[model samples]
Target: GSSGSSGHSHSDKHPVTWQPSKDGDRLIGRILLNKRLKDGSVPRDSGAMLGLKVVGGKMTESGRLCAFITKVKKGSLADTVGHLRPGDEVLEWNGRLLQGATFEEVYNIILESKPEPQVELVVSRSGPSSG
Candidate 1:
């Protein structure tokens, strides 16, 4: 496994990768999923996803919801945001951390974001390799 900046090394070897975030390239452990809109406004029902499918959070012991992507139709808007995988966890939206948000609260955030050219996000990198 890759050695971490914390100076700790893992015995199990796995390839490491990075992604862009509001704060530059953070680790997959610090996932980022930025979605910049092209047009000024997207239709209310735009195929763009609302974290597609969410897991964890109030529904679990953590009471901290994290969104994930699922059932993304090939070549659809969601699919085009190809950084997402089935289990990658969305940690932040815009500058808001998804701490106490209910699924609906998060849903409104996505549905309500309109007439904007930006959809900045942060998500945990997926796979057993994630730290």
Candidate 2:
């Protein structure tokens, strides 16, 4: 008696493309603002007046208190920096982490930093690839 055997084979070709995900794509940036005039005198309306309005003090999924930039005044110090955006998330003020801070606390932090000639801000926003 003779027996016959059958063999089967399969092949698959997949082309993978590099694409950035929305949630995973984020960019962090530091913004520096000069609060003094050419004469080395603080502006009459300086400190907490960087020409940026912020909102949103809710805890994010990551358990960090986050604030969103609501508006950036045109021709203001922040606008002049050219780095801050209306949707950017405020992460720190003058090297102080904003995590777990309330809206009022964050506001005060920025205000307190105004005494300094230069204000440093660390913010995070969606990556440019996200459109």
Candidate 3:
């Protein structure tokens, strides 16, 4: 490996490979849907979910593609799903992977979910993992 060869590269001949969302870039994932979300859905200017609760620095549950809500707004998507609870980590989504998956991947799913004005999230629960 020479000069960041192991990381993502711009050239096909010398591709750079890096670890997964180890970058925690998923933090930006919310932006992709900002325009589509309801007003005040997330914190203004901070790109944080307004009504969503993400503790432990935005890391989803281990062995899960994304985090599920232990608590959701009474009118929020999670609440509608029912059978959710605190400390229950999301593991899957609409028959697909949930943890560590790229935000884009999840965003695309959300857009396609088309559960009325808001997309219904599908998730599994587990204890929090190291960030």
Candidate 4:
């Protein structure tokens, strides 16, 4: 078919889409958390309960979205969530595996996830895992 006759060609309409690499994106751990009910004594939301401070950016080599646990507040829900260590990395948010997400993108995702009845995360520790 002529390009002009069809108004568009397959090559022009169907552009090649590139998918991010998932090779270096394996997860060593996962965290499944649910919003807890409030008590009369201390009422708080899940985001508040999870006192984890994260820094989001691209991995140096992989160029993938990585949220690092910068700080873990003591006596906070994140303290015991997911067997998390001091410097664990967040690879998945909810269920979408983060690849090229920016900090703002991740922040927006987090904000939108407020009041999430159940939240899931994929985490990985640095270096090789121990037996």
Give per-model TM-scores: 0.52, 0.67, 0.35, 0.61
lDDT of each: 0.50, 0.70, 0.37, 0.59
Positional deviation of residue 90's Cα in model 3 after best superposition, in angstroms: 2.1
- Stretches of candidate 2 above 4 Å error? 1-25, 61-64, 128-131
lDDT of 2 by residue, 55-118 (tens): 6465789877787788889877777764466877777778867766788878777778867787
List runs of model 3 lying over 4 Å from the truth. 1-65, 80-87, 115-122, 126-131
45, model 4: CA deviation in Å? 2.1
Best by TM-score: 2
Best by lDDT: 2
- Sort by lDDT, best first: what order? 2, 4, 1, 3
For model 1 the TM-score comes to 0.52
Candidate 3 accuracy as TM-score: 0.35
Clashes of each: 5, 0, 16, 0
TM-score of 2: 0.67
Q: What is the lDDT, from 0 to 100, of the residue 122 in candidate 3?
A: 37
